[PDB]
């Protein structure tokens, strides 16, 4: 009964950090979609400037 | 040892080769799934020891 | 999870820096000025009518 107190605290400390992890997951998955959309845009502007149709 | 040093080189390349297969978007939610069911297993084992203190 | 968070922060910074640097340059910067189109004289001459 001195062990079950230790385990019973360790069990609650785990679920506390699952809750934090799950809130951060949402914010990170948002940032990864935004960054990937901007990468495709900046690649499009480069290829346009490389064709330079207005110089021809 | 020389073959320790070669081992740690070849082992580190293989571990890096895996690390860049991890897609941040897929693995980051699987990690939370795994960490949730770990708590389901743990709670069963704890309760099984509480039953015996009672007994 | 922590190892995968750093990958996300690397992508975000790489995108933002390339976009920020392309935000410099004379044409893109002048394009942000309101009266930048250069017809304000004939526009004014029309407004006079």
Curated annotation (Swiss-Prot), chain A:
Disruption phenotype: Essential, it cannot be completely disrupted. Cells with very low levels of protein have no ordered thylakoids, are barely green and are non-photosynthetic. It is found in: Cell inner membrane. Belongs to the PspA/Vipp/IM30 family. Required for thylakoid formation. This is Membrane-associated protein Vipp1. The lineage of its organism: Bacteria, Bacillati, Cyanobacteriota, Cyanophyceae, Synechococcales. The gene is vipp1. The chain holds residues 112 to 155 of 267 of the full protein.
Swiss-Prot record, chain C:
It comes from the Bacteria. Disruption phenotype: Essential, it cannot be completely disrupted. Cells with very low levels of protein have no ordered thylakoids, are barely green and are non-photosynthetic. It is found in: Cell inner membrane. Disulfide bonds: none annotated. Required for thylakoid formation. Belongs to the PspA/Vipp/IM30 family. This is Membrane-associated protein Vipp1. The chain holds residues 168 to 216 of 267 of the full protein.
């Amino acid at each position: 009964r001195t062990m079950s107190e230790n385990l019973r605290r360790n069990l609650a400390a785990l679920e506390a950090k699952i809750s934090e992890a799950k809130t951060k997951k949402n914010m990170l998955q948002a940032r990864a979609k935004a960054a990937k959309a901007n990468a495709e845009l900046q690649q499009t502007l480069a290829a346009a400037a490389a064709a330079a149709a207005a110089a021809a | 040892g020389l073959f320790d040093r070669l081992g740690r080189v070849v082992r580190a390349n293989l571990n890096d080769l895996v690390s860049k297969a991890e897609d941040p978007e897929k693995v980051l939610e699987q990690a939370v799934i795994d960490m949730q069911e770990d708590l389901v297993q743990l709670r069963q084992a704890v309760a099984r020891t509480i039953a015996e203190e009672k007994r | 999870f922590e190892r995968m968070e750093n990958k996300v922060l690397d992508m975000e910074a790489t995108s933002q820096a390339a976009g920020e640097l392309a935000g410099f340059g004379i044409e893109n910067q002048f394009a942000q000025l309101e009266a930048s189109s250069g017809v304000e004289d004939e526009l004014a001459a029309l407004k006079a009518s």
